[PDB]
Amino acid sequence: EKIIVSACLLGQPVRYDGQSKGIVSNWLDALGAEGRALAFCPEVAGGLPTPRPPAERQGEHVVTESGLDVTAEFDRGAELALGLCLAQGIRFALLKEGSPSCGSGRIYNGRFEGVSMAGEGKTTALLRRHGIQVFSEDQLPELALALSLV
């Protein structure tokens, strides 16, 4: 049984600033070694470049600080994540917290002022709407238990 993982959590330099959010986790390493962790970046899959300017949700819209609307790419990446899960039989996701794409518990408020609020990213919202459970890097034991049970 596989999971879809935010590519940045696996150390891939696909973050908006070309950096990575590689996490230290023996369990995630073992899952990867078994070919069960499918790296995925909604923003890069949606057609956005690396690097790219920061973006925040404003309701259903996703915009940059300058007002550029990038919802089309966010929604494409969200739909490609779902497509990958349906094709591979994946029903769990390990996505990056705070992201306008991958956030599951929190996101930035859309005012470009460093203020976080409770909410979810566009990919997470789509995945959960289709019955796929989304966990963050702060919920690895919960995700591991859910995956061990099936």
**81 forms part of the interface with ligand SF4 (CB under 6 A):** no
- Token pair recorded at residue 35: 């070919």
Q: Cβ distance 77 to 97 under 8 Å?
A: no
Binding string, residues 24-63; x marks residues near ligand SF4 by CB under 6 A: -----------------xxx--------------------
Least distance (Å) from ligand SF4 to the CB of residue 90?
A: 15
Give binding residues for [4Fe-4S] cluster as ranges.
41, 43, 102
Give binding residues as ranges.
41, 43, 102
Taking CB under 6 A as the binding criterion, the range among 6-14, 28-36, 82-90, 124-132 that sits at the site for ligand SF4 is 6-14
Q: Cβ distance 95 to 134 under 8 Å?
A: yes
Cα–Cα distance, 102 to 93 (Å, whole number): 10
**6 forms part of the interface with ligand SF4 (CB under 6 A):** yes
Among 3, 4, 14, 37, binds ligand SF4 (CB under 6 A): 14
**73 forms part of the interface with ligand SF4 (CB under 6 A):** no
Residue type, 76: R
The helix/strand/coil state of 94 is strand
Cα–Cα distance, 126 to 139 (Å, whole number): 19
The helix/strand/coil state of 63 is strand
**91 forms part of the interface with ligand SF4 (CB under 6 A):** no
Q: Which of residues 92-131 bind ligand SF4 (CB under 6 A)?
A: 96, 99, 101-102
CA angle 64, 130, 103 (to 5 degrees): 35
Cα–Cα distance, 15 to 21 (Å, whole number): 8
Note the residues at the interface with ligand SF4 (CB under 6 A): 6-8, 14-15, 41-43, 96, 99, 101-102
